[PDB]
Amino acid sequence: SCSLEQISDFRHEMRYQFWHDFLGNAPTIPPVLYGLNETRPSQDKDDEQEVFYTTALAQDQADGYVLTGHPVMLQGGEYVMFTYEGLGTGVQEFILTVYGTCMPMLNLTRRKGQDIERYYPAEDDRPINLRCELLIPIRR
DNA sequence: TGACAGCACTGAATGTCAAAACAAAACCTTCACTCGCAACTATAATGGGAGCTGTCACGGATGCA
DNA sequence: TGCATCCGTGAGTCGAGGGTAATAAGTTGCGAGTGAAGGTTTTGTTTTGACATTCAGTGCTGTC
């Protein structure tokens, strides 16, 4: 529960300690990352909500993945490949320039569901200019 | 020369009179049932101690006799 | 004038481990009190006339 500028300042740790707990027992490095944001309103007065953020490990070439959590089936329907070049501090303004601008300036209405993030940890000191997709479930 | 400072006034955009509705549970009816009282039953029956408690110890006491 | 009897008294501060267990009749009648929660009532968050300003708006007005 944080600010507009803290829409990715808080979100940096929710992928990292989730990754480095599993990397202590991972013989590989899974190179496709998945993050899921959720908007769920209330029932008492319809002015409030809460957000449960789920980063996940990919069902990839390593079959045995003993990770705490849930087997999450990704939502189907229309999506958008918002590929990017920039560091996780640059997805801070990239999430804000897709959601402050690219939903008005491309005039699109994102649909109900989990906003799929597609980071790339395959290029994980210099500041890393990573590549990432923001696969929004869209209703065009 | 062009900035550079300040004025003229629209008006959309505020700050007030009203309701408009929605869940809030809050207090409140309800209405069927679960959960409780009370009475009777007719061959014959008739007297506890329920286990208990066993010698400390000098001392003062009151009332019987 | 003794002789029995009947009450009422008895270290200090600690300590441990911890409350235990008989037996007995039912059907039938039938009012009273959780209770299903049925459903209202309130006690608060939202629409619309206003018009009085206000700054926003755009341009001019005047100026270094």
From Swiss-Prot:
Cysteines joined through disulfide linkages: none
Role description: Transcriptional regulator. Binds to the right arm of the replication origin oriC of the chromosome. Rob binding may influence the formation of the nucleoprotein structure, required for oriC function in the initiation of replication.
Protein name: Right origin-binding protein
Gene (name only): rob
Residues included from the entire protein: 146 to 289 of 289
